[PDB]
Amino acid sequence: AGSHCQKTSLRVNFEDIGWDSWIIAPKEYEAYECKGGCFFPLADDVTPTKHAIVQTLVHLKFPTKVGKACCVPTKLSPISVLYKDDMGVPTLKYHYEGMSVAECGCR
Amino acid sequence: AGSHCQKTSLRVNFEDIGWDSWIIAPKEYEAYECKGGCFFPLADDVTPTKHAIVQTLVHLKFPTKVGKACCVPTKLSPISVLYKDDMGVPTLKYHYEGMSVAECGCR
């Protein structure tokens, strides 16, 4: 094998990130994260874009002058949050988009 | 201001990256790259996903245990390439997708 950009656990506490004046509930959620490398040889269990492949090759050849491809979320999922509105009313946002990692990849 | 994830020049030579047995022309192309940081405060000239914002906050708080959001291509464009087929014939691939950066963002 070789490199392994993959989804791993990341639990986030809203108070810790300064959002608790606005997000009442939940207190914490599973955001996940993408970690691991993008270097050859790759996983036959993912697909980078051609640009990521190109950049990976150039980085191997000229490491000081172009950076690596980066392991990032390529698809995200919503969560539900209970938030204080402007009239100060607790309101359910049923699908708060872009909150949790669904898929990771090299980009 | 603050962080600045942005598109910058990156010219790529196909021979240098080992592709010249397959790509006859062009010899080089403008792939571009995305460089710069994803840290607060952000550009009012881009939009990260909520997960990137969340991860940026957690990284600020707990830097040794979650990594930063990463500046990556968020949209790509094709180029035309002249390639040797299997019968060894030079053939135009008019839109070879995913080859050049169109837009960058923090993810």
- CA angle centred on B65, ends B64 and B70, rounded to 5°: 90
Q: Are B81 and B96 in contact (CB under 8 A)?
A: yes
User: Å from B91 to nearest chain A CA?
Assistant: 19
Q: Which of A16, A57, A66 sits opposite B33 (nearest CB)?
A: A66
Number of DSSP helices (H) and strands (E) in chain A, helices first: 1, 7
Instruction: Supply the range of the domain harboring residue B18.
Output: 1-107
**Which residue has 């690596």 as its token pair?**
A68
Cα–Cα distance measured from residue B96 to residue A23, given in angstroms and rounded to the nearest whole number:
45
Q: Are A105 and A71 in contact (CB under 8 A)?
A: yes
Indicate the resolution in Å: 1.9
Interface with chain A: mutation pick from B51, B53, B71, B79, highest number of A CBs within 10 Å:
B51
User: Å from A88 to nearest chain B CA?
Assistant: 23
User: Å from B53 to nearest chain A CA?
Assistant: 9
**Residue among B106, B49, B98, B96 at smallest CA distance from B75:** B98
Q: Are B61 and B44 in contact (CB under 8 A)?
A: no
Three-state SS string across chain B, please?
Answer: CCCCCEEECCEEECCCCCCCCCEEECCEEECCEEECCCCCCCCCCCCCCHHHHHHHHHHHHCCCCCCCCCEEEEEEEEEEEEEECCCCCEEEEEEEEEEEEEEEEEC
Cα–Cα distance measured from residue B36 to residue B8, given in angstroms and rounded to the nearest whole number:
10
- Elucidation method: X-ray
**Which residue has 């009442």 as its token pair?**
A24
Largest CA distance in chain A: 58
Q: What is the CATH number of the domain that holds A106?
A: 2.10.90.10
Number of domains in chain A: 1
**Residue among B64, B76, B56 at smallest CA distance from A105:** B76
Tokens at residue B98, please?
A: 């995913």
- Phi, psi (degrees; rounded to nearest 5) at B59: -65, -40
